[PDB]
Amino acid sequence: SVGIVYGDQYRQLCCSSPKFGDRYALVMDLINAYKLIPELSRVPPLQWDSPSRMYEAVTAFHSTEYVDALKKLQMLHCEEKELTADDELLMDSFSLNYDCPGFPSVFDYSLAAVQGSLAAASALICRHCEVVINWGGGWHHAKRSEASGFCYLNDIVLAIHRLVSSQTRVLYVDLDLHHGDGVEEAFWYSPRVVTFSVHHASPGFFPGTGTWNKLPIFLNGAGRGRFSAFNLPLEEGINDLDWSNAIGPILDSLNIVIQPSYVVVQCGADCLATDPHRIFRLTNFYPSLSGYLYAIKKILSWKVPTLILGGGGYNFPDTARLWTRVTALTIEEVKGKKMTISPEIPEHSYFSRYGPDFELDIDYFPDSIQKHHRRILEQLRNYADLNKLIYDYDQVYQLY
Ligand SMILES: O=C(NO)c1cn(-c2ccccc2)nn1
Ligand SMILES: [K+]
Ligand SMILES: [K+]
Ligand SMILES: [Zn+2]
Numbered sequence: 001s002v003g004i005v006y007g008d009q010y011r012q013l014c015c016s017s018p019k020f021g022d023r024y025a026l027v028m029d030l031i032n033a034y035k036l037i038p039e040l041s042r043v044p045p046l047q048w049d050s051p052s053r054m055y056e057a058v059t060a061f062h063s064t065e066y067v068d069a070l071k072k073l074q075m076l077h078c079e080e081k082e083l084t085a086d087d088e089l090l091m092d093s094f095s096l097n098y099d100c101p102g103f104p105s106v107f108d109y110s111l112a113a114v115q116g117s118l119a120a121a122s123a124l125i126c127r128h129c130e131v132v133i134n135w136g137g138g139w140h141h142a143k144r145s146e147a148s149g150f151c152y153l154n155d156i157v158l159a160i161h162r163l164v165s166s167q168t169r170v171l172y173v174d175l176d177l178h179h180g181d182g183v184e185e186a187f188w189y190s191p192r193v194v195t196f197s198v199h200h201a202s203p204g205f206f207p208g209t210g211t212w213n214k215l216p217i218f219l220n221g222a223g224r225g226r227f228s229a230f231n232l233p234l235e236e237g238i239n240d241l242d243w244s245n246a247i248g249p250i251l252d253s254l255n256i257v258i259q260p261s262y263v264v265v266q267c268g269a270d271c272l273a274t275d276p277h278r279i280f281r282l283t284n285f286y287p288s289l290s291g292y293l294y295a296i297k298k299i300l301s302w303k304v305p306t307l308i309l310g311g312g313g314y315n316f317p318d319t320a321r322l323w324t325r326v327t328a329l330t331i332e333e334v335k336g337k338k339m340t341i342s343p344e345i346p347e348h349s350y351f352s353r354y355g356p357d358f359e360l361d362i363d364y365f366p367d368s369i370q371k372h373h374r375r376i377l378e379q380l381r382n383y384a385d386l387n388k389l390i391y392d393y394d395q396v397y398q399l400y
Pocket of ligand 2: 174175176177178179180197198199
């Protein structure tokens with residue numbers, strides 16, 4: 001079946017942050033308004049038997065002292081008093097400041113995404129679901145002991161760790177506008193988790209990595225993980241077709257050579273033309289075919305158990321518009337069952353958020369890459385050689 005993570009408490013927690021507001025409620029209620037929920041298997045978020053078990057799960061990646069600080073941050077923000085100078089310094093040492101501030105539910109909010117993505121990994125491992133979707137997860141920037149880009153706990157890394165520890169190889173595909181630095185870093189030394197991020201990069205643009213680092217070079221992993229971290233940085237303004245042609249052959253080549261046991265896709269919605277970032281010009285169109293839907297369709301065609309996660313996306317109605325279509329496409333491709341979606345937003349609780357036109361399409365009128373393809377193809381060959389993987393070089397070369 002196709003699973004999707006939700007629950008009443010889960011929804012409350014995912015809607016408790018100052019930055020993402022009620023975005024999760026709009027996403028799930030649009031999916032419900034299009035009558036998709038009966039097609040989906042609800043996957044409940046993971047809960048634990050004790051504080052000690054919870055800490056064991058989260059500190060599989062994060063440090064105990066970072067988790068301690070994040071829990072303390074929530075406790076401090078549940079009291080009226082200002083933080084002490086010592087406590088401010090403590091939070092600063094974990095980057096729990098500026099773009100990752102405290103708020104009264106910051107620990108429960110961050111933990112909830114972990115609970116959802118770990119439950120999603122488990123549903124794939126026991127084969128209850130072929131694909132599981134978690135639109136409350138996808139927080140790819142968080143590091144072992146550092147919050148980053150309103151990511152506090154890295155649910156993706158923890159989900160992948162549960163998958164790889166279930167010859168298991170995971171392919172991670174990061175479609176967010178931003179480089180997936182936290183996930184890349186976590187698996188920098190691991191050949192069994194191959195990471196691939198497509199993103200914008202330019203001087204001063206967050207987080208700064210995923211690009212050229214004497215002709216400067218692309219770093220791509222270290223130790224036994226050399227050549228196992230893949231990146232495609234793209235110039236601003238790219239449209240659905242050029243983004244699809246840029247990543248399409250890379251995705252197919254990675255699947256052929258790696259033969260992954262699981263695929264984990266981060267589907268951050270900030271590449272939409274209507275995102276306030278206004279960097280890329282992707283759409284959610286489904287006849288100009290949405291780059292997101294193109295990539296998800298291709299990944300799902302491999303018939304590999306797959307985890308689909310959220311991420312960025314600061315236009316909340318248009319994020320719901322895109323992820324609703326991703327969800328319908330996943331049902332269609334997995335179950336072989338057509339999903340008809342009206343071009344008009346159905347009546348429901350959040351209908352007013354989709355004005356003034358109330359349509360499902362977002363409101364938008366639509367050399368360098370060749371060199372990246374040759375570089376990435378050589379890195380894939382180097383990865384295959386280093387890791388004793390066999391494949392016909394010319395079936396792969398033909399893809400490009
Ligand atoms: O959407 C994102 N990444 O997925 C993001 C964007 N943020 C950002 C932080 C500082 C400056 C500019 C942008 N932090 N995270
Ligand atoms: K990305
Ligand atoms: K890796
Ligand atoms: Zn982003």
